[PDB]
Subunit: 259 residues, 3 copies
Amino acid sequence: NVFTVLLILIYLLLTALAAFLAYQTISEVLEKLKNPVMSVTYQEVDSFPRPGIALYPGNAQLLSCSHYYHNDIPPVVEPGRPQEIDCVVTEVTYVKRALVVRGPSEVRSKEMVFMQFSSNETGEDFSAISYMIFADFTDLIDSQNKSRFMGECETNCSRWTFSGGFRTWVKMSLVKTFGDSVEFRQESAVVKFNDRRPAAEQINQLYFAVFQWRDPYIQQNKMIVTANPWSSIAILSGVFMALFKAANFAKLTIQWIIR
Amino acid sequence: NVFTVLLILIYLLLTALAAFLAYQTISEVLEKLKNPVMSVTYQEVDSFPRPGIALYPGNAQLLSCSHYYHNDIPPVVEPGRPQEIDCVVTEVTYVKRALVVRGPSEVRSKEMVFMQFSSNETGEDFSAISYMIFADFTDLIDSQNKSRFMGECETNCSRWTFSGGFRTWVKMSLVKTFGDSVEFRQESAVVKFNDRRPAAEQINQLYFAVFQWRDPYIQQNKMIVTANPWSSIAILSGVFMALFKAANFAKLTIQWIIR
Amino acid sequence: NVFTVLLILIYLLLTALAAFLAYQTISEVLEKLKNPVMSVTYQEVDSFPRPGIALYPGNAQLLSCSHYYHNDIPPVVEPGRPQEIDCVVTEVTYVKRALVVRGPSEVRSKEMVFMQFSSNETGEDFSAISYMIFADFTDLIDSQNKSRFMGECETNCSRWTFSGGFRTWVKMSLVKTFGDSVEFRQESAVVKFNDRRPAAEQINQLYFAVFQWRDPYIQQNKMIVTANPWSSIAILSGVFMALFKAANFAKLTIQWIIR
């Protein structure tokens, strides 16, 4: 009577296959649950809120802050001192002065902030001006104390520079992270400014900069996990249901073979 | 006779667990169906088709367009006017002249397009030359009218610049998007050209540029969704099958306990 | 007796639905198995091992290699020749001399390697100095022959340049790929150095460079496939179990309708 030994063999092979599938599903779901996957989405926005460009001039002085639309850069009429157009907020924080310039809105009309500095430097030998871009300009002027908020952004918001003698076309764009947080990233483009001034007044450098928006989109980053635990739990129920089914079918076939 | 109340309790708990799994699977599949995932693939290509580099010189004049292999840049023999080598297509579109230069093929042999401009500028004060790279040069010369095709690429294809006085080593690479579309992206590298000319003829700037391919690969972008709706529908069938099974086993156990 | 024709019709529709689900699950799992998905993870590291910056000066000579902490760049006391501080390894490979400079550790203290070159160039007309960053400096000095290891890194590790007359603030960061491999990527920032030297000794250029770490993180890249084959095999078992179940329920309902 070797029929019950063969029935125990096919039941042992069926529970071995069910235990192998139950190990492999839990191992694969834990492996896809360990490493998350970033998912990108481009939300279109027709008009941005006006950001703040917190420039840090050491001894430089702002000479222009004129907005220009539709990529129309005119020739500058003189490298002396004209009057500003945009609203500047000169504030002194300590964690240094931060000449905050209100940035551009209206991305579809291509608005830029052409600005121009000048510095007769004598102590430093690397002509740079740092800056830092935060998300909203009205949050600065609608604050009860500006030196708390600019201090707070001097720890988290990152600082780039531009050079002395070059127009630095800065094209910024937003990135929103979920999981909320909103940060900037820019791409400079250096173009040499040829001096056609007399050589008596060429001791002072000139710092041009163009800040515009790149494209009317906001990149959205969501951290997503590609493992499904509830589905995996169900899949284990469908395995543990067929481990009973195939054992009952083998118990029927083991008696039907000697009928 | 409180046995039917306990059978209705275990059947209510089983259909509550089945309704909870049927809500959670549909919610998880809709959440993973909302946010897609970009998938990158690097198709290797041994030889690229020759692209077109649509330069926009304002008043500059091309002085060289010589190909060089194996990263061999020779010294330029004179900053005057030699003769060109590559094929230029001077065409006038309006949406400006677009001196289209046929780009490099043979990425494994490291072919580049060394070019040199010159401009005695008097009206502008930012020495830049814009350019724009489209995917195939033979599509321009095999067109019935070139001002339709260049006008079409002046809306979609993006424009970078290079400066006056610097060699701008542009290393381009393709990106193909699926979901078809093919676009470029480049990374410049500015190196200062020191003038060793007499100072009588230093009124005109010099614009050097090097266009080569970066690596023999084409990055392929496919938008992929990590949710499986057919599998989810099946998983719901396996849940709604075990909601009957466990209720039948509870109906057997409720009568077997008082046997 | 048209009841068996209707039972064969509902059994044919049930095996058609089961064959459609069994085709669609295998097609969706093969489609999500064809295209893999890159997964990013940022492992924090409090202190990096010191890398090697394999500069290639043609005829330039190193004049300083001083470390500075906490973004404190002092004024350089003279553009002549001071003495070095960091350890340089001048070695001659051929696949050229490779003046290997030991890079910075201690990312949280913001350590940089300020260096300064000088070259009275007469044969070349593009003032550039190439470099190349490998992962560990002690692997070079703890090698039995340095010209094998530098040869081997001259094929795989990529080469950037910096210019003559500009401070090039290089901010490097690691990327580790799995599937092991470790590579660098940097982002330069060019700032013009204004010469305040007498014009008799301005025939030689000056090459400044700053090498620091960007942020205390190591980006980890794992290639992950979003398809689950074992789960798909199970899902097929749950489909092929319900194809029997619904056929048995239709066989019960076809006799219960004429009871």
